[PDB]
Amino acid sequence: QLFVTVVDTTRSTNMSLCAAISTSETTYKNTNFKEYLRHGEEYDLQFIFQLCK
Amino acid sequence: PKVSGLQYRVFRIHLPDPNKFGFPDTSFYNPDTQRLVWACVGVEVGRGQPLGV
Amino acid sequence: ATVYLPPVPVSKVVSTDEYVARTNIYYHAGTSRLLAVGHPYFPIKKPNNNKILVPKVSGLQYRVFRIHLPDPNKFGFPDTSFYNPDTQRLVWACVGVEVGRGQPLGVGISGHPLLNKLDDTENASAYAANAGVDNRECISMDYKQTQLCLIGCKPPIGEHWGKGSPCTQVAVQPGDCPPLELINTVIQDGDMVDTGFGAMDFTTLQANKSEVPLDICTSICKYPDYIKMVSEPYGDSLFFYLRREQMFVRHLFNRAGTVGENVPDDLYIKGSGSTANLASSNYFPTPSGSMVTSDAQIFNKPYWLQRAQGHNNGICWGNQLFVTVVDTTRSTNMSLCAAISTSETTYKNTNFKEYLRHGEEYDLQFIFQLCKITLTADVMTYIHSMNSTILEDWNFGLQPPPGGTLEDTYRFVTSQAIACQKHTPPAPKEDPLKKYTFWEVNLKEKFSADLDQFPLGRKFLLQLGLKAKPKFTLGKRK
Amino acid sequence: GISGHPLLNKLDDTENASAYAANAGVDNRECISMDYKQTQLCLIGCKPPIGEHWGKGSPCTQVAVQPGDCPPLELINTVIQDGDMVDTGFGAMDFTTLQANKSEVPLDICTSICKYPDYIKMVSEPYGDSLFFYLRREQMFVRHLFNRAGTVGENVPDDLYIKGSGSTANLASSNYFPTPSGSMVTSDAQIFNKPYWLQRAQGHNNGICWGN
Amino acid sequence: PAPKEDPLKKYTFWEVNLKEKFSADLDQFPLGRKFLLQLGLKAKPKFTLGKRK
């Protein structure tokens, strides 16, 4: 087994966007352009394994 | 789901055994004399992404 | 059973220097101080036309140089008289770049007239039951301090988060956050650096297009996808990179809007009125840069190149160089007023018309080593596999097969057939040296037989042992 | 050096901000004083050294840039003279004809040229008698972002944001200027006070005087 | 016949199967190249250097 625990808060991207209810409405209400935030989290794991006996 | 870097990211890595896997050449290896085991001798932890918190 | 092959032919890619010899022949080159007068908040165009009045040039933009070099045999020398072009062929290797910088101390900056805001939520200045309608503020910020430099010989591909196709999980719908789907594409000249919400398009993703400054809403922000590029075995898209980046949070702000999608609200107890309401869930960290020192810089110092990344040794493929710089440090913001007309001996703001400019300055100075590639058949095989165009430029020509057999119905001449039919390739190609706008740097007629009487020149001599007067000392003591 | 102007050009706060405002009204200058960024340098030469500054460049007629948008700022190089002002943290430029208000900044720099040393010309010189020794320690930071008073004359395409309502359908000043700061003085930041044995120089001249 | 194997998986994890991604290449992964730079000596290095600031 390998158990690897990573916490990383330093580069962990959070992104901002919104969906419009319509762009015809010239407001910016809570139910017009409805704001949002997401988080995109990237890791990658590479190994190299030496054989043993 | 919730994906934040303030949460523990635990990767459960499940591995076989070398015995259960490749043998290049058989020449000093007898299942009697010895049994084979993985040693992961290098790892890369990739984390290049844009910034956020 | 297993019982391993172990497995072949992979086939692995060998270094170019074990059939390439560097030689003591060197030429020098340079540029003449590249200077740009930009604008950073928005593009300043002529207000009756689409041509720029002042182009948009920020220090928070990747400035991407397509360097182009002539073939060294079509820019041949009379001093080669020990070399053969039938067994050998010539290639530049750029073995040194020094990047001149020296513009006034002055830091890049951005802002937005209608940055989407309600209240401050690093600490509460209000407690609201629900968030506003139509509330936005005049607030300025730069993204973050970025200094980087990369030198390649093909174009570098950067990442960003695109607008995705609708999924179950997240769809492009009101009440539902859009999916972020990864689009990799080559770094354009003037493409923006990150915001601190990362690399993404904001044109499409931000429907409201008033959350972030005008300049980055219009741009796509990229971060270089370094990872994909060193998993290139060849690594000809880059072979040099470094970066220095950092960011700060100077305060959380809360959007004036709120989510329309679900936030669980059975996971904490609900009182009356305001405490039976959700009102913020749309907090955002406002990005800012930080305190800049101007004694520490990547730039003003010579980068000795040779045995470069990939199985590229730093030899020019295509005789091309691709240089991507951000430098925010000396990227001046100018603040000035000129009056349209003055007829007033009292002040008014309506008389004196503010104007701002941006300065972007870079200089490139180069020492190049002439090198040769010793040619045989197996070596020929490796090169066509790498890039057949290189062999062709020189022209050793074809090489049959392919080959192939068509069977189709004939008279001849078709008439009956498919019929007829033509297949156009296309022809025309987009062309991958004009895949995207690039700051053409011409060094085809800026070469020099003069190799020491440069500042780079003097440092080159200091490198090969000492040489030259004065060094050091310096300065220095006590 | 504490310097300041009772009439420094300031509209609104923009660091964290606290209100909105459209285009400027009339008379927004304030009593504000400032400390200039940390700048220490020294240079030793034996022929006057070359500065750069952004001077007054091409006219209003050889471009299409208005009067009220200023004739272009073109880098005009010339020798540093005693009593010349230094780099201000807004770039090193003329401020006599480049501020028509001429009371945007502290009193000293409301007139005269500002220069920064033009190291590239002196050090690429194949004689290097303009200088042959320099050192410096410098830094700057943003104390606070503020906005100039003065009407936009710049071109903001307004169709790159989807319109508000009333006040947020209106367009603010975008005439941001950072104010520099060079605070925290320390006596381990001296480049002075210290002998620099010029047994050899760092130029292309080894420090051997000419003209004495 | 159950309950129940497995005792390893009785807790929530980012499940990572690694049993089939085993290779022998070291010049195609950048991780292979950095490994050789420590080890076989080999890489083949500079990399590049001298001087990059």
UniProtKB/TrEMBL annotation, chain A:
Subunit architecture: Self-assembles into homopentamers. The capsid has an icosahedral symmetry and consists of 72 capsomers, with each capsomer being a pentamer of L1. Interacts with the minor capsid protein L2; this interaction is necessary for viral genome encapsidation. Interacts with protein E2; this interaction enhances E2-dependent replication and transcription activation.
UniProt-recorded name of the protein: Major capsid protein L1
General function of this protein: Forms an icosahedral capsid with a T=7 symmetry and a 50 nm diameter. The capsid is composed of 72 pentamers linked to each other by disulfide bonds and associated with L2 proteins. Binds to heparan sulfate proteoglycans on cell surface of basal layer keratinocytes to provide initial virion attachment. This binding mediates a conformational change in the virus capsid that facilitates efficient infection. The virion enters the host cell via endocytosis. During virus trafficking, L1 protein dissociates from the viral DNA and the genomic DNA is released to the host nucleus.
Domain of life: Viruses
Family per similarity comment: Belongs to the papillomaviridae L1 protein family.
Localization (cell): Virion; Host nucleus
TrEMBL record, chain E:
UniProt family annotation: Belongs to the papillomaviridae L1 protein family.
Subunit (UniProt): Self-assembles into homopentamers. The capsid has an icosahedral symmetry and consists of 72 capsomers, with each capsomer being a pentamer of L1. Interacts with the minor capsid protein L2; this interaction is necessary for viral genome encapsidation. Interacts with protein E2; this interaction enhances E2-dependent replication and transcription activation.
Residues spanning the signal sequence: none
Function field: Forms an icosahedral capsid with a T=7 symmetry and a 50 nm diameter. The capsid is composed of 72 pentamers linked to each other by disulfide bonds and associated with L2 proteins. Binds to heparan sulfate proteoglycans on cell surface of basal layer keratinocytes to provide initial virion attachment. This binding mediates a conformational change in the virus capsid that facilitates efficient infection. The virion enters the host cell via endocytosis. During virus trafficking, L1 protein dissociates from the viral DNA and the genomic DNA is released to the host nucleus.
Record's protein name: Major capsid protein L1
UniProt-annotated location(s): Virion; Host nucleus
Originating gene: L1
Species per Swiss-Prot/TrEMBL record: Human papillomavirus type 16
